[PDB]
């Protein structure tokens, strides 16, 4: 009885993640209006949540329901490395979009000159190269479950999640303070566009942080107080709560921004 319900829930989650990410990709690519330099990061995030669903999620589902691993160590290392790489390739795209918004808001009239398209291409290429190199030089070279230890496990929690979070919080606090202080930003329509896009980015970032904070807190604690310190139910509830964010993001994109809603309505 319970197994049927959980399998249906997992199938629904995978379905929503795949369908939503393909919808975002199709809408952004097809419609000319929605092709802008800020949406390059959003499409990258869409690909980075498309792959997690297409590949990582089905195996995690099988493993969770069956409760046994059978594919073998050779595949298992690929699956954990891939899983690790996609997380590193999502916490860097969020950083770049937040840098875009800080650059636009804090220094208006210089946004076109500073954020050149070549720079955006360099940023995406660098982000993927660093993600893949780190994932396979911390998977192939050492240091199915992620294996916490003395320095590898503790260091990753502090450097990957907690460090970008505080820079992003400082950037957003300053951006909100300037936004409140100033009266007119850049034409009235331009001001409203900047404010609405800033709201979109701030809500996507806050949703990501709220979804992934419990898992990383557990990850730090398991290093601090032992691998088996926490229960299994607490260990596996957080993972799925973290994974739900990929499905959740397309709904946020459509609801917050009118252009996404229009493009989706045209598409289907």
């Amino acid at each position: 009885a319970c197994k049927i319900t959980i399998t249906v829930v997992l199938a629904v989650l995978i379905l929503i993640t795949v369908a939503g990410n393909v919808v975002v990709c199709l809408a952004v690519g097809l419609n000319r209006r929605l092709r802008n330099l800020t949406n390059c990061f959003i499409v990258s995030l869409a690909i980075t949540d498309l792959l997690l669903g297409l590949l990582v999620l089905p195996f995690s589902a099988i493993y969770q329901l069956s409760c046994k691993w059978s594919f073998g160590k050779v595949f298992c290392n690929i699956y954990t490395s891939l899983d690790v790489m996609l997380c590193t390739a999502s916490i860097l795209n969020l950083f770049m979009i937040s840098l875009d918004r800080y650059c636009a808001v804090m220094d208006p009239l210089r946004y076109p000159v500073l954020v050149t398209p070549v720079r955006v291409a360099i940023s995406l290429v660098l982000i993927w190269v660093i993600s893949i190199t780190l994932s396979f030089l911390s998977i192939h070279l050492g240091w199915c479950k992620v294996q916490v230890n003395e320095v590898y496990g503790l260091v990753d929690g502090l450097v990957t999640f907690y460090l970008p979070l505080l820079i992003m919080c400082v950037c957003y606090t300053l951006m909100i303070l300037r936004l409140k202080s100033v009266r007119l930003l850049s034409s009235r329509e331009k001001d409203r566009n900047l404010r609405r896009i800033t709201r979109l980015v701030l809500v996507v970032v806050a949703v990501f942080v709220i979804c992934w904070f419990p898992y990383f807190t557990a990850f730090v604690y398991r290093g601090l107080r032992g691998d088996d310190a926490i229960n299994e139910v607490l260990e596996a509830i957080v993972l799925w709560l973290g994974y739900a964010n990929s499905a959740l993001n397309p709904i946020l994109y459509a609801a917050l921004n009118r252009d996404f809603r229009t493009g989706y309505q045209q598409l289907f």
Partner: nanobody
Amino acid sequence: RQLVESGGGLVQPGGSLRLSCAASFRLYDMGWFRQAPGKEREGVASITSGGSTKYADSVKGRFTISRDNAKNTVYLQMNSLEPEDTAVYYCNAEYRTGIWEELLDGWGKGTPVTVSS
């Protein structure tokens, strides 16, 4: 939100009337205009949140504008009132409903002033 205007009355020539406008996210500007029976709307004074002020040529040297930030109340003090100043003095306020919202404008109902007695 409602802009309440007051201080409108019949005044003998040479009299003084202090007007007051009360507005109930942020208020950026407040202005005063006068409309006479056969004349177009004319600006008399405007004040920013900072407190910078500009005046029309005729108004200059007789009208003063100041802003109370705490209570969101502005006033205009008219001195040396003359029959040319007979008009319905209208209040005007610029405000933002929310942090992400667009800037909007507000118009008062008008306080009628007659410089006769």
